[PDB]
Swiss-Prot record, chains A, B:
It comes from Human immunodeficiency virus type 1 group M subtype B (isolate BRU/LAI). Residues 1-5, 49-55, 88-99 are annotated as: Dimerization of protease. The active site is at residue 25. The chain holds residues 501 to 599 of 1447 of the full protein. Residues 20-89 form the Peptidase A2 domain. This is Protease. Homodimer, whose active site consists of two apposed aspartic acid residues.
Length: 99, 99
């Protein structure tokens, strides 16, 4: 698809067996999801942006289905105000910005 | 152009006759620039990012070039870690997300 940007580019994702709504975000290095359980090992991380930093749990090699496309990558889990699909997974589905 | 996302989608902008670097950010509703001087009056705005809410100065109808494309519109000035071009101005330069 071609997604215009008149509105927030929200898509449905499946992660950890759960459906969630998430923002396709070229300005995010990594994927950041609201509190949820994920399997396997993790390590703490601090990520920052407008308003400062939050503490997240970094899970690697997590499978996500993004608007019908499967991808594997890093997911950060923490108190994010919106679920964000970042560049680490956008690349895997071949997403580009065009103008 | 067609911009892949393996690295940050940074472009050159021109505002106030000055060249600056900015991030093309589909996850940003608004355009937010680091502290600079702009003409005219400003109005207050609060925006909420990953770490919480901040106060910014809103300047309207500002001429800005983005990657060689002219836009005219609202610019928020405040303590952002990086200059971000949000959907307000991405729509003006005809940007879309594609996969
Ligand atoms: C390491 O991975 C990440 C680190 C930080 C972020 S972020 O959410 O802080 N952010 C990074 C951007 C902003 C600074 C920078 O260098 N890159 C992703 C953004 O797209 C973010 C994504 C976002 C975070 C929180 C709420 C809504 C969207 N949007 C955002 O801050 O937009 C600002 C806030 C206002 C709300 C929406 O638009 C308005 C303008 C995401 C993943
Ligand atoms: Cl960060
Ligand atoms: Cl590619
Ligand atoms: Na893992």
């Amino acid at each position: 698809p071609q997604i215009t940007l008149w509105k927030r580019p929200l898509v449905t994702i499946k992660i950890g067996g759960q459906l969630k709504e998430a923002l396709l975000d070229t300005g995010a290095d990594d994927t950041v999801i609201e509190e949820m359980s994920l399997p396997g090992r993790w390590k703490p991380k601090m990520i920052g942006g407008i308003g400062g930093f939050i503490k997240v749990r970094q899970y690697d090699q997590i499978i996500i289905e993004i608007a019908g496309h499967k991808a594997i990558g890093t997911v950060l889990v923490g108190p994010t105000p919106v679920n964000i699909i970042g560049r680490d997974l956008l690349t895997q589905i071949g997403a580009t910005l065009n103008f």
